[PDB]
Design a protein around this motif. Structure first.
Motif, PDB file in Angstrom:
ATOM      1  N   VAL A  11      24.210  44.164  49.021  1.00 22.77           N
ATOM      2  CA  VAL A  11      23.518  45.220  49.792  1.00 22.77           C
ATOM      3  C   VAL A  11      22.597  44.603  50.858  1.00 22.77           C
ATOM      4  CG1 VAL A  11      21.563  45.602  48.151  1.00 22.77           C
ATOM      5  CG2 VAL A  11      22.325  47.457  49.610  1.00 22.77           C
ATOM      6  N   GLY A  12      22.631  45.145  52.081  1.00 20.28           N
ATOM      7  CA  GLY A  12      21.929  44.584  53.248  1.00 20.28           C
ATOM      8  C   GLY A  12      22.580  43.331  53.869  1.00 20.28           C
ATOM      9  N   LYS A  13      23.691  42.835  53.296  1.00 16.03           N
ATOM     10  CA  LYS A  13      24.516  41.717  53.811  1.00 16.03           C
ATOM     11  C   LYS A  13      25.968  42.132  54.123  1.00 16.03           C
ATOM     12  CE  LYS A  13      21.707  38.382  51.106  1.00 16.03           C
ATOM     13  NZ  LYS A  13      20.950  37.754  52.226  1.00 16.03           N
ATOM     14  N   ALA A  14      26.328  43.381  53.822  1.00 14.60           N
ATOM     15  CA  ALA A  14      27.670  43.944  53.924  1.00 14.60           C
ATOM     16  C   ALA A  14      27.642  45.456  54.221  1.00 14.60           C
ATOM     17  CB  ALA A  14      28.395  43.663  52.600  1.00 14.60           C
ATOM     18  N   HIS A  15      28.805  46.012  54.571  1.00 17.36           N
ATOM     19  CA  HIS A  15      29.056  47.449  54.744  1.00 17.36           C
ATOM     20  C   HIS A  15      30.269  47.912  53.921  1.00 17.36           C
ATOM     21  CE1 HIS A  15      31.208  45.785  58.567  1.00 17.36           C
ATOM     22  NE2 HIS A  15      32.162  46.152  57.697  1.00 17.36           N
ATOM     23  N   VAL A  16      30.386  49.224  53.682  1.00 17.28           N
ATOM     24  CA  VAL A  16      31.612  49.840  53.139  1.00 17.28           C
ATOM     25  C   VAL A  16      32.760  49.700  54.146  1.00 17.28           C
ATOM     26  CG1 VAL A  16      32.654  52.097  52.488  1.00 17.28           C
ATOM     27  CG2 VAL A  16      30.444  51.435  51.567  1.00 17.28           C
ATOM     28  N   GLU A  47      32.697  44.772  52.866  1.00 13.27           N
ATOM     29  CA  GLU A  47      32.981  43.720  53.848  1.00 13.27           C
ATOM     30  C   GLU A  47      31.666  43.115  54.374  1.00 13.27           C
ATOM     31  OE1 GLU A  47      35.603  43.110  58.006  1.00 13.27           O
ATOM     32  OE2 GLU A  47      34.778  45.095  57.582  1.00 13.27           O
ATOM     33  N   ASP A  48      31.545  41.784  54.363  1.00  8.19           N
ATOM     34  CA  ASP A  48      30.358  41.067  54.855  1.00  8.19           C
ATOM     35  C   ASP A  48      30.067  41.285  56.358  1.00  8.19           C
ATOM     36  OD1 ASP A  48      29.313  39.311  52.446  1.00  8.19           O
ATOM     37  OD2 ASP A  48      31.490  39.124  52.388  1.00  8.19           O
ATOM     38  N   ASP A  49      28.781  41.314  56.725  1.00  9.09           N
ATOM     39  CA  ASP A  49      28.334  41.559  58.108  1.00  9.09           C
ATOM     40  C   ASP A  49      28.699  40.421  59.084  1.00  9.09           C
ATOM     41  OD1 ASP A  49      27.057  44.000  57.217  1.00  9.09           O
ATOM     42  OD2 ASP A  49      25.077  43.068  57.118  1.00  9.09           O
ATOM     43  N   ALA A  50      28.586  39.162  58.641  1.00 14.10           N
ATOM     44  CA  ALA A  50      28.719  37.977  59.496  1.00 14.10           C
ATOM     45  C   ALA A  50      30.167  37.467  59.679  1.00 14.10           C
ATOM     46  CB  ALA A  50      27.825  36.881  58.903  1.00 14.10           C
ATOM     47  N   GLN A  51      31.099  37.857  58.798  1.00 15.35           N
ATOM     48  CA  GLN A  51      32.457  37.291  58.715  1.00 15.35           C
ATOM     49  C   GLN A  51      33.449  38.242  58.016  1.00 15.35           C
ATOM     50  OE1 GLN A  51      30.504  34.314  55.492  1.00 15.35           O
ATOM     51  NE2 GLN A  51      32.553  33.691  55.949  1.00 15.35           N
ATOM     52  N   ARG A  52      34.746  38.123  58.341  1.00 16.37           N
ATOM     53  CA  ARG A  52      35.848  38.934  57.780  1.00 16.37           C
ATOM     54  C   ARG A  52      36.174  38.523  56.329  1.00 16.37           C
ATOM     55  NH1 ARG A  52      41.070  39.347  56.847  1.00 16.37           N
ATOM     56  NH2 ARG A  52      41.304  37.193  57.338  1.00 16.37           N
ATOM     57  N   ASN A  53      35.326  38.947  55.395  1.00 13.60           N
ATOM     58  CA  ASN A  53      35.342  38.579  53.977  1.00 13.60           C
ATOM     59  C   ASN A  53      34.994  39.797  53.098  1.00 13.60           C
ATOM     60  OD1 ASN A  53      35.188  36.061  52.000  1.00 13.60           O
ATOM     61  ND2 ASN A  53      33.424  37.291  51.546  1.00 13.60           N
ATOM     62  N   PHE A  54      35.627  39.916  51.924  1.00 14.99           N
ATOM     63  CA  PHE A  54      35.682  41.163  51.151  1.00 14.99           C
ATOM     64  C   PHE A  54      35.339  41.007  49.666  1.00 14.99           C
ATOM     65  CE2 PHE A  54      38.598  41.184  54.750  1.00 14.99           C
ATOM     66  CZ  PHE A  54      38.185  42.330  55.453  1.00 14.99           C
ATOM     67  N   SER A  55      34.847  42.096  49.073  1.00 17.63           N
ATOM     68  CA  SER A  55      34.590  42.237  47.633  1.00 17.63           C
ATOM     69  C   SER A  55      34.809  43.689  47.189  1.00 17.63           C
ATOM     70  CB  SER A  55      33.148  41.817  47.292  1.00 17.63           C
ATOM     71  OG  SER A  55      32.775  40.595  47.915  1.00 17.63           O
ATOM     72  N   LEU A  71      30.911  42.704  40.501  1.00 18.44           N
ATOM     73  CA  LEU A  71      31.254  42.381  41.891  1.00 18.44           C
ATOM     74  C   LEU A  71      32.471  41.439  41.921  1.00 18.44           C
ATOM     75  CD1 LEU A  71      30.534  42.767  44.901  1.00 18.44           C
ATOM     76  CD2 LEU A  71      28.947  40.891  44.685  1.00 18.44           C
ATOM     77  N   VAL A  72      33.659  41.991  42.173  1.00 21.78           N
ATOM     78  CA  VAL A  72      34.918  41.230  42.236  1.00 21.78           C
ATOM     79  C   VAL A  72      35.111  40.661  43.643  1.00 21.78           C
ATOM     80  CG1 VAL A  72      37.422  41.301  41.823  1.00 21.78           C
ATOM     81  CG2 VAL A  72      35.924  42.658  40.387  1.00 21.78           C
ATOM     82  N   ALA A  73      35.134  39.336  43.792  1.00 18.31           N
ATOM     83  CA  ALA A  73      35.345  38.670  45.081  1.00 18.31           C
ATOM     84  C   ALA A  73      36.839  38.615  45.474  1.00 18.31           C
ATOM     85  CB  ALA A  73      34.717  37.271  45.024  1.00 18.31           C
ATOM     86  N   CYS A  74      37.138  38.844  46.761  1.00 17.23           N
ATOM     87  CA  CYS A  74      38.507  38.907  47.301  1.00 17.23           C
ATOM     88  C   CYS A  74      38.763  37.935  48.474  1.00 17.23           C
ATOM     89  CB  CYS A  74      38.811  40.363  47.696  1.00 17.23           C
ATOM     90  SG  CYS A  74      38.568  41.482  46.279  1.00 17.23           S
ATOM     91  N   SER A  75      37.789  37.090  48.835  1.00 19.24           N
ATOM     92  CA  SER A  75      37.853  36.177  49.997  1.00 19.24           C
ATOM     93  C   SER A  75      38.208  36.938  51.295  1.00 19.24           C
ATOM     94  CB  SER A  75      38.779  34.984  49.681  1.00 19.24           C
ATOM     95  OG  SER A  75      38.352  34.316  48.502  1.00 19.24           O
ATOM     96  N   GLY A  76      39.007  36.362  52.202  1.00 14.85           N
ATOM     97  CA  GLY A  76      39.526  37.055  53.397  1.00 14.85           C
ATOM     98  C   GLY A  76      40.698  38.018  53.140  1.00 14.85           C
TER      99      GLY A  76
END
Length: 114
Positions: A11-16, A47-55, A71-76
Motif C-alpha cells: 500500500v502506497g507503493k502500488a495500485h490496483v 501493480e508497483d508504481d515504479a516498474q511493471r511488476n505484479f502481486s 501477498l502472492v508475488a508474480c514478478s513481471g
DNA sequence: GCGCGTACGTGCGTTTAAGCGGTGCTAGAGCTGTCTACGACCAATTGAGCGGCCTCGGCACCGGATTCTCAGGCCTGGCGAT
C-alpha cells in the motif's frame, strides 16, 4: 479502486490493476444464520508504481475482524497474477470472472458486493 | 411462549377368578341361669395440698472482644470459530 490499508508491505507503493472497463479489486462475503457464518474475503491484483511488476493481495476473516492475509508475488508475469486472482474468485464462487456482468449466485459459496 | 420427549388414554384380544347358586357344617354371639366380688354409702381421723410468707441466684442485658459469612471485587484455561 484503493489498495487495502492492511496490505502494509505494498500500500502506497502500488495500485490496483485495471484494463478497459475491468478492475482487479473485489470484496466477497458469506453469511448464513443456520450454521453461524458471517465472513469476508478481499482479492486485489496489485501493480508497483515504479516498474511493471505484479502481486495478488488477499485478506479475510469474520466481518469487521482482522483475521488472516497473504501477498502472492508474480514478478513481471501479469498472466500469472490474473490467473491467481480469477482462480481464487472462481473457487470461492463456483462461477467465472469474465462473462458474469449479470451476477448469478449459488448455495455453499460467497456472494459479492457492488 | 414452545421444542420435543413419553406415558396413559383409547381400541382389540386373551383368559382368569369375580360373581353366583347351591351344599354343608360347627364356631360363637346371644339367651337364660348362678352367685359372690366389690363401689358407693356412711363417719371419725389427721396430714398432704394449697394460701401467705420470704429470699436468693437464674435470667435478661448492657459493655467489651472475636469469629462467621455475604457482598464486591480479581485471573487462567477450554475450546469456538477462522
Amino acid at each position: 479502486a484503493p489498495v487495502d490499508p492492511e496490505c502494509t508491505a505494498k500500500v502506497g507503493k502500488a495500485h490496483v490493476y485495471c484494463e478497459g472497463n475491468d478492475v482487479y479489486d473485489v470484496m466477497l462475503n458469506q453469511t448464513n444464520l443456520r450454521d453461524n457464518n458471517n465472513k469476508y474475503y478481499l482479492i486485489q491484483l496489485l501493480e508497483d508504481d515504479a516498474q511493471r511488476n505484479f502481486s495478488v493481495w488477499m485478506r479475510w476473516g469474520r466481518v469487521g475482524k482482522m483475521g488472516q492475509h497473504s501477498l502472492v508475488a508474480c514478478s513481471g508475469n501479469l498472466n500469472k497474477a490474473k490467473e491467481i486472482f480469477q482462480k481464487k474468485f472462481l473457487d470461492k464462487t463456483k462461477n467465472n470472472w469474465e462473462d458474469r456482468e449479470k451476477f448469478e449466485k449459488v448455495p455453499g459459496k460467497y456472494d459479492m458486493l457492488q
